[PDB]
Amino acid sequence: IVGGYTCGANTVPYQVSLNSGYHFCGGSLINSQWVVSAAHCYKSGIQVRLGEDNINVVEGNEQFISASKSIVHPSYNSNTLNNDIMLIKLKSAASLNSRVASISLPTSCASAGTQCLISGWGNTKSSGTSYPDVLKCLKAPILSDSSCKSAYPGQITSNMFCAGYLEGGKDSCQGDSGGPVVCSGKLQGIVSWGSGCAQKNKPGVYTKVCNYVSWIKQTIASN
Numbered sequence: 001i002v003g004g005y006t007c008g009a010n011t012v013p014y015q016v017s018l019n020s021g022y023h024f025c026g027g028s029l030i031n032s033q034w035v036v037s038a039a040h041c042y043k044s045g046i047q048v049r050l051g052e053d054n055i056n057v058v059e060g061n062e063q064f065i066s067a068s069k070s071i072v073h074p075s076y077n078s079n080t081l082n083n084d085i086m087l088i089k090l091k092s093a094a095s096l097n098s099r100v101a102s103i104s105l106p107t108s109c110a111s112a113g114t115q116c117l118i119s120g121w122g123n124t125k126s127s128g129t130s131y132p133d134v135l136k137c138l139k140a141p142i143l144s145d146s147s148c149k150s151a152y153p154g155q156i157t158s159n160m161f162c163a164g165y166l167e168g169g170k171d172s173c174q175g176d177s178g179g180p181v182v183c184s185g186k187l188q189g190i191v192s193w194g195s196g197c198a199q200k201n202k203p204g205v206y207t208k209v210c211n212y213v214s215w216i217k218q219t220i221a222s223n
């Protein structure tokens, strides 16, 4: 997160860190045994780390659970990043409490201007790499589809939306990938892609979760 602030320990209880010997992507807990992340964060050997604040220090509240299976969307396209969503089933259910809790899936899509919270342990510099130890937060609005398409002509599908600031300075970045975009208490987006981080007129592009709720529900129900 570039231009964001320290969230505060466990203030984002649905935030998870996907770890393979180091933090590589974020994710969101949607129930005690399932997490939603981005398809481009897929790899084998994933350990899901819940209740984390400093990812390099065991401070208490952490639950480390191995992923039993990861389900990348069948129509995921790695060239366009269209359908960039993946479901990870945990080997055992997590113990939910005030520090580890799930986030609700949306019943409707959000509108432009809706302010959302994006969080993660991704890079905090736009020019260079600085990864943080604790969780960073950024409040950002969903942009209108004309502004989004004008920024990325020909690259936005109906399963994506842009959020952020066209003036640059505040944005999500690599490492925040797969993590949550929460608006009014509902998971509306997944950190997917953008041109650089916090560059002027190049907002972040997010997977539009409201278009996948029946898919998530049917897939969970059958696995």
Ligand SMILES: NC(=[NH2+])c1cc2cc(-c3cccc(OC4CCCC4)c3[O-])[nH]c2cc1Cl
Residues within 6 Å of the ligand: 024, 025, 040, 041, 042, 171, 172, 173, 174, 175, 177, 191, 192, 193, 194, 195, 196, 197, 198, 202, 203, 204, 205, 206
């Ligand atoms: N807000 C933005 N401008 C932005 C920037 C990046 C940058 C990435 C990104 C860059 C390099 C590698 C990535 O994933 C690899 C690391 C782990 C597996 C795939 C990214 O997600 N994702 C991004 C997502 C966004 Cl929304």
Ligand SMILES: [Ca+2]
Residues within 6 Å of the ligand: 052, 053, 054, 055, 056, 057, 058, 059, 060, 062
């Ligand atoms: Ca920790």
